[PDB]
Amino acid sequence: IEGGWTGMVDGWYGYHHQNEQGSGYAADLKSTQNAIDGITNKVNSVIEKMNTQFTAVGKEFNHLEKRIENLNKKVDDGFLDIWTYNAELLVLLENERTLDYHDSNVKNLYEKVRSQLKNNAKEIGNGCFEFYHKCDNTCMESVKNGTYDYPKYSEEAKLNREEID
Amino acid sequence: TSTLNQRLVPRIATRSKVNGQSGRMEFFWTILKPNDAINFESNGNFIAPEYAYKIVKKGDSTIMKSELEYGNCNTTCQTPKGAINTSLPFQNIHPITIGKCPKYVKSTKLRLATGLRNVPS
Amino acid sequence: GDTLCIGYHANNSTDTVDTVLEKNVTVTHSVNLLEDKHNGKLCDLDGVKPLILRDCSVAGWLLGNPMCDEFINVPEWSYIVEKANPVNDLCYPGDFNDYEE
């Protein structure tokens, strides 16, 4: 699937059903909702940054070269620009993990529909299933709800293949 | 003092006349606890203390380094460069802040990705 | 023939989000953690005006510099504002100690 769908503004991952009756864009509810739950929890958990406690820390040379100041200075300046870099990495990290998580959900749904349909359809296009037989609106729901049944439409589909075979 | 028994010495050495005076005058301080004694003894080069600030209502504050006027707006926050009344977790403005104020990061942008790659048509 | 197609979401969010592999990647939805919004005029905090020390340095206010004497019995301040490069108060020739302390 190398092309995005603008019409699927309800959820991320969706199916474009096409029957003799018509064509629509139906999002998969469980995939989108579960993914949204996981992504949101990642976001809120990443926020936890738990900076070091405010240990009321400051010193200075005290006119006697008490570099505790330049030590404590570096220590705070060195904790930042290190944690900041480290945090930039964690953002970039989580960014990719969300992106590949998305690609994985795509491929999982495509395998779901392949497993149900099997040889009752042709894999054609960028993730499109051309039904040899006619999947009714209900039948389209059954594939979506995971309740599709191969045998009922099997024989009809088989004869159609043999016609073009 | 209680602990700061700071027996000091002047030093006869400076640079050119600053504002018409070549010599220097380093000043000092000490936070003093109640019922504590401050034994000052000197026989020269000493600028003795005659007035002092009684610390009262100790409360969170800081020392802001900027040249900006006063606002007529009770804003939940102040930073050397201005104020902030939002909720985003982190800042890039300035570490020095007042009470309620997001944390400070030196990054130019920190955006977490929560959606798909936006590829229209 | 009857067909079913698979697809992901796409909107018009120009939001750019960087990754380890790529940068300036436009995503459909994103969250921002940093922010650069500041008015520029130093306002108030919780209804508590600050000790805007105008020109006189913090040392001068403490050391009682004759110029800028107006700030002596000012009531409690939520914070203290010092202009950088204090010009009016030269605090005289001298080096304060344990300063940032």
Partner: antibody
Framework: QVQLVQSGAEVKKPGASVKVSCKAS????????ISWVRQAPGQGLEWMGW????????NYAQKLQGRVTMTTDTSTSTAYMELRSLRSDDTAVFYC???????????????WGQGTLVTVSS | DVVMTQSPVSLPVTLGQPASISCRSS???????????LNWFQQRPGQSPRRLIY???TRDSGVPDRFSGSGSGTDFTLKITTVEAEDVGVYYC?????????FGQGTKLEIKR
């Protein structure tokens, strides 16, 4: 503008189905969703469910999942909440509120309805 | 599941005494959209609930400037200056971004003292 008209007050016996209707207008009904809230007599506010007119995405509250059935008539822009099984404890007043339809988008109970109280005792 | 704890349930006030109502969540309340979601509500007794602050920092069209939603982390607050008389009533936190939507308990106001 703001017009979330709830149904009339309803009185039933335990174990009978109840049907509340919230008819909406005076404001664009662009698939905007509708959620239903319950306030026990002089007690807390408990969210019961949400339905997206854009889709059929119901989210009945775990506590009450089997009994509760929610519907939408886009043509009349009317939502419906139906509690199949009734209880004396369920006796309360029910409230409606608009919600955003897309799960991707957040929620907005911008408009609230007229409280349909429902009494359930033998 | 989400737990919205409302700290000051009982809140008597005197006219013109900015008072605050604190809502504390069990988990962070940010969402994929990007914005937090704690639209405060007010149900003036005898009337149906009303909305105040959209998200965490957005006053509603017909809301007095007195009402102000605040807070960034799990602990959010709502402070109304010049507490007036229609201001009295019950208030609830907003449902968490989690689909478990949680209004939490209520906070009641008094006219004077």
């Amino acid at each position: 503008q703001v017009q979330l008209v709830q149904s009339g007050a309803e009185v039933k016996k335990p174990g009978a189905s109840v049907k509340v209707s919230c008819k909406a207008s005076g404001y664009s009904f662009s698939s905007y969703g509708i959620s239903w809230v319950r306030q026990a007599p002089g007690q807390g506010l408990e969210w019961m469910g949400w339905i997206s007119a854009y889709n059929g995405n119901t989210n009945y509250a775990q506590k009450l999942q089997g009994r509760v059935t929610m519907t939408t008539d886009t043509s009349t822009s009317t939502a419906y909440m139906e509690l199949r099984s009734l209880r004396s404890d369920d006796t309360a007043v029910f409230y409606c509120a608009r919600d955003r339809p897309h799960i991707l988008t957040g929620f907005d109970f911008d408009y609230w309805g007229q409280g349909t109280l429902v009494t359930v005792s033998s | 599941d989400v737990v919205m704890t409302q700290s000051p349930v009982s809140l008597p006030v005197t006219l013109g005494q900015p008072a605050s109502i604190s809502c504390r969540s069990s988990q962070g309340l940010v969402y994929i959209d990007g914005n937090t979601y704690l639209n405060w509500f007010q149900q003036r007794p005898g009337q149906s609930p009303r909305r105040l602050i959209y998200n965490v920092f957005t006053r509603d069209s017909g809301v007095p400037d007195r009402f102000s939603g605040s807070g960034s982390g799990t602990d959010f607050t709502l402070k109304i200056t010049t507490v007036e008389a229609e201001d009295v009533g019950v208030y609830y936190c907003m449902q968490g971004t989690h689909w478990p939507y949680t209004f939490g308990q209520g906070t009641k106001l008094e006219i004077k003292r």
